[PDB]
Design a protein around this nucleic acid. Structure first.
Lengths: 146, 101, 63, 151, 75, 186, 138
RNA sequence: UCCAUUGCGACAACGAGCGAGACCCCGGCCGCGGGCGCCGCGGGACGGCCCGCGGCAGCGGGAGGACGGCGGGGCGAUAGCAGGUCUGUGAUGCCCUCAGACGCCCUGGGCCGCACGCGCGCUACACUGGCGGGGCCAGCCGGCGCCCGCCAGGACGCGCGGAGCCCCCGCCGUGGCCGGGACCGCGGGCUGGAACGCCCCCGCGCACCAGGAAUGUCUUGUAGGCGCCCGCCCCCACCGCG
């Protein structure tokens, strides 16, 4: 078996043990909206060593991620359905996840709102469980300027 | 005689009261070809309220249950004959008699 | 040195202050008929063979 | 499912000669016997077919202890409704064993043959009084309570 | 903190394991994998090929446990 | 020949007189599911078949609690493995193991009066069987956490090694440890 | 009957291999992409999941027969619970669209002809499915 | 002696009583009438008998036997407590606010804010576990169909109908893991005057790798494990009665 461990793509090492499927959801997690709805099949083998997979199969896989709609993946699997930008449905890849997170957080700051104060002050947003639940780590409403 | 089929249904809280009304309908109907009485599965009406009006104490709860038993009697008779049967039947106040044509 | 087989001729009473212990009157299953009360834990009934004893330790009937 | 007229509701005509009830853990199995060609099928399903394959060996206990000439030829159609899964198998086992007993019928010492089956398996002829108990106020389950904070 | 996850090139590694299987009288599906440095998924496959060969005999069949002893191990 | 169509229940013998009446190998249904309400009465280990008593003992740890069926399977796979480990009767290995894993010597405090220092006590000949079926299983359980070995073979490791007077299983190293507690606290 | 004697697992797996040669039903693409159920953790990896489901519905259908099983009815045979939440899990249904295609496709092959409350097998189908069982046992 | 002044003996006490019992509710089983909905009415295990001891009441070991000497429940004395509730009320005393009202309507809040600390819960830490399709199974006592939509749901309708765990073969190495499911971006909806409620789909992979003192709660269908229904409710269960 030419298991071929590593075979890193997208600046993220993979494994000679991981099946061809977990290898993408395990591409840092960031960069793969998973549930393997299309990932389970794609054109790649269901259950084999992920290094053994041929480059040609990997390259076709890279293309299906690059244009999800062309593969035939339904829009619901993809993450950015409507987009607040040019409003165009798009997938999110590894680097864009944290760039888009900056886009979501920095937009929040420029458009001041309760949902932004509940992130700049580090309060958990939505749940309102900053009352009696998360002693955990000290990520709770504290304060002490003077 | 336009022999209509009548279904008679009786819903009552007390078994002692229900059996007496059931016996009268069977007793009155021997002349009119009465089908024997059908006993319903008990209809439980449980209500559970913590007994204490205030919140003090290990809440203890009152399970208040009302049992409904319904009785089905099929009769094939004229519209008047049930009325003649009615005078003979002993009427217990508040017990319900349902005439289903 | 071997645990000596014993015959539980009869069960006496439950003691130890928690009732846990049930000291029983015993006799030797193997030996010149040595018979002495011994301290037992767990369920015991007459004619039981207790093969878990060193013989020297001696218990008593006052309780 | 629950004490209905399902005793014979499914089958019309071909009156099956024997009617024998078997019950374990709220599971009702009425055994119908026609003394045929070795049909021990219960729930219109083969004896070998079972929810737990390992459990089937227990339901073959009259077959091993009592003569096989009995099960060599018989006919069966059993309506089992109710029970989680394993409750159904012991109820089935009560049904079929009583069904074989009902077939012996005429020999007066039918009980003596049946008691060899009781001696190997008690409750194979008897129904248990074990039934689910109820919770009470302050109790998550039948025999417990919310954990008490102070003794 | 690891073993040999997969990496089963079928050359001398694969020949050593079935010869190790020729050394061990009885084999357990999870047991061989840590007996000879490999993952469980590899363990069932070679034994199935030994079953295809007829050099492996099964006694218990279940999703959780499959056990194999060589048919010709008595040699 | 009534145990999984193998391992005859009749073949098993009382190797030890230490516990005889309590071990019951006379009335076992093949694959002893034996759900039979043996909770009433204080003296009936005859009513609880030893293998099925072990069945009850094997389900535990909260997650597997209630799963008596997962024990009937556990015993069968270990017994096949025991047959593959030694051509002897696996139920006989069970009689030897339960006799060899329960404590000969224990010491409760038994301070009848005031001060409590553990006092040496010979165990009841019924008590030893109950703990042995508890310790053997718990030997597999103790090492059933991240072990590569499945629980069934974990149990098969315990019964066979502790079956003779050799001690490798946690269960027998418990009997020897408590025996030592009752040699010290004499 | 031998259709009650063919173990359900054996019947369902064996029936779909010749159904593959048959070309009956024709499992669509979006369905083979989607994960069955609204409670399933992730998609089943059977690949031929739609074809394997088709051998599952028509066998339970033989027992149901005249009483009939609607779209919810076959979802009932494969009903599951979510395994991943901090709070306890309340039982929920599987996906309606995948089930609605499997017996609607089966109506098309004429093995199932249905016109009652939800769906019933055409006698030709009941006989033929039973005939596959007749081959399966003996 | 009994859970129990529960008795049996004996006694300046002698008779009564009220608690406990009895009784009622549901099962253990059967019989008679019946019946759609198996459901109404009876009976029945009586410490009866056996053996040992018992002044005797009782007391073990027993067998038959649906069941062993209360089935699972309710109702519960005298006497109290400065316990709780004036915030359920046509239960209300005194005392207050009585029209710029503590009256009564609308509109937007808040109880969903909130270091740490707790008082219950819930899900985990995987290997008897996952996650896998796919054989299923109830008992509360409950309605379904068809068609689009991944679902969420929506339309069009007809009155009609059932769990999970587990059990299947599989996929899977001891990897904070394909353990766990947090936090949290992106959409699809629901219903409501209105989400700030909720669910589904798709990211994401928090802590946590067996829990220190110190604690609870329980002996058979019991503990635990695993699901259903209701109470409240447009919305929404981890809660409680079952």
């Amino acid at each position: 078996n030419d298991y071929r461990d590593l075979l890193r793509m997208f600046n993220t090492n993979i494994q000679g043990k991981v099946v061809l499927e977990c290898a993408l959801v395990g591409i840092k997690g960031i960069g793969r909206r998973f549930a393997n709805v299309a990932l389970k099949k794609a054109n790649i083998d269901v259950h084999k060593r992920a290094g053994e997979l041929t480059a040609a199969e990997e390259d076709a896989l890279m293309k299906v991620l690059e244009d999800p709609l062309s593969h035939g993946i339904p829009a619901w699997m993809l993450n950015r359905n409507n987009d607040f930008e040019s409003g165009k449905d798009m997938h999110i890849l590894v680097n864009t996840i944290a760039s888009t997170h900056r886009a979501d957080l920095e937009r929040l700051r420029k458009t001041r709102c309760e949902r932004g104060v509940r992130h700049h002050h580090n309060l958990k947003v939505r749940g309102q469980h900053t009352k009696s639940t998360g002693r955990r780590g000290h990520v709770v409403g504290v304060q002490r300027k003077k | 005689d336009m022999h209509q089929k009548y279904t008679i249904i009786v819903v009552g809280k007390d078994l002692k009261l229900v059996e007496r009304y059931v016996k009268s309908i069977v007793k009155e109907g021997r002349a009119f070809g009465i089908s024997g009485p059908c006993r319903a599965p008990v209809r439980r009406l449980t209500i559970t309220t913590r007994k204490s009006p205030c919140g003090e104490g290990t809440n203890t709860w009152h399970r208040f249950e009302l049992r409904m038993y319904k009785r089905t009697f099929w009769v094939t008779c004229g519209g008047n004959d049930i009325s003649t049967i009615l005078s003979k039947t002993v009427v217990i106040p508040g017990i319900q008699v349902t005439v289903e044509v | 040195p071997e645990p000596i087989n014993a015959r539980v001729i009869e069960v006496l009473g439950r003691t130890s202050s928690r009732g846990g212990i049930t000291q029983v009157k015993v006799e030797f299953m193997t030996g010149e008929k040595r018979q002495i009360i011994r301290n037992v834990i767990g369920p015991v009934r007459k004619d039981d063979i207790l093969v878990l004893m060193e013989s020297e330790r001696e218990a008593r009937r006052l309780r | 499912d629950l004490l209905e007229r399902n005793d014979i509701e499914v089958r019309e005509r071909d009156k099956y000669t024997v009617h024998t009830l078997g019950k374990k853990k709220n599971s009702v199995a009425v055994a119908f016997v026609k003394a045929g060609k070795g049909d021990i099928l219960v729930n219109n399903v083969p004896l070998a077919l079972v929810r737990p394959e390992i459990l089937r060996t227990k339901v073959s206990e009259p077959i091993m202890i009592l003569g096989e000439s009995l099960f060599k030829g018989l006919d069966m159609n059993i309506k089992v409704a109710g029970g989680g899964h394993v409750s159904q198998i012991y109820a089935v086992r009560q049904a079929i064993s009583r069904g074989v007993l009902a077939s012996v019928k005429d020999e007066a010492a039918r009980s003596e043959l049946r008691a060899k089956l009781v001696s190997y398996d008690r409750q194979l002829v008897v129904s248990d009084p074990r039934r689910c108990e109820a919770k009470k106020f302050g109790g998550r389950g039948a025999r417990a309570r919310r954990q008490k904070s102070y003794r | 903190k690891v073993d040999y996850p997969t990496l089963f090139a079928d050359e001398a590694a694969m020949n050593e394991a079935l010869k190790f299987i020729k050394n061990s009288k009885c084999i357990t599906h999870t047991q061989i994998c840590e007996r000879l440095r490999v993952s469980v998924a590899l363990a069932k496959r070679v034994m199935r090929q030994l079953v295809k060969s007829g050099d492996f005999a099964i006694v218990s069949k279940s999703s959780r446990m499959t056990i194999f002893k060589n048919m010709t191990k008595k040699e | 020949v009534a145990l999984f169509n193998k391992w005859p229940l009749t073949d098993v013998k009382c190797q030890d007189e230490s516990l005889e009446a309590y071990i019951s190998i006379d009335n076992h249904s093949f694959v002893p599911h034996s759900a039979g309400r043996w909770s009433a009465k204080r003296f009936r280990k005859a009513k609880c078949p030893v293998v099925e008593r072990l069945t009850n003992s094997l389900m535990m740890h909260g997650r597997n609690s209630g799963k008596k069926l997962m024990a009937m399977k556990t015993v069968g796979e270990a017994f096949e493995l025991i047959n593959l480990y030694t051509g002897k009767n696996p139920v006989q290995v069970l009689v030897d193991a339960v006799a060899n894993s329960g404590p000969r010597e224990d010491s409760c405090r038994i301070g009848k009066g005031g001060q409590v220092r553990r006092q040496s006590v010979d165990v009841s000949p019924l008590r030893r069987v109950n703990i042995g079926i508890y310790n053997i299983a718990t030997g597999a359980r103790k090492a059933a956490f991240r072990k590569v070995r499945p629980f069934a073979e974990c149990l098969a490791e315990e019964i066979m090694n502790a079956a003779a007077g050799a001690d490798k299983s946690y269960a027998i190293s418990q009997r020897n440890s408590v025996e030592r507690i009752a040699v010290s606290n004499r | 009957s031998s259709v009650t004697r063919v173990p359900a697992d054996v019947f369902i797996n064996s029936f779909a291999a010749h159904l593959k040669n048959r070309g009956i039903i024709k499992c669509p693409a979006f369905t083979d992409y989607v994960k069955t159920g609204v409670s399933r953790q992730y998609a089943p990896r059977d690949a031929d999941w739609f074809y394997i489901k088709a051998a599952s519905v028509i066998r339970h259908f033989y027992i149901s027969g005249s009483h009939s099983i609607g779209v919810a009815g076959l979802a009932r045979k494969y009903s599951s619970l979510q395994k991943g939440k901090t709070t306890p899990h309340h039982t929920k249904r599987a996906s309606c669209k995948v089930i609605r295609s499997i017996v609607s496709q089966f109506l098309g092959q004429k093995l199932l002809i249905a016109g009652e409350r939800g769906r019933h097998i055409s006698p030709n189908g009941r006989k033929m499915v039973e005939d596959f069982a007749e081959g399966l046992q003996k």
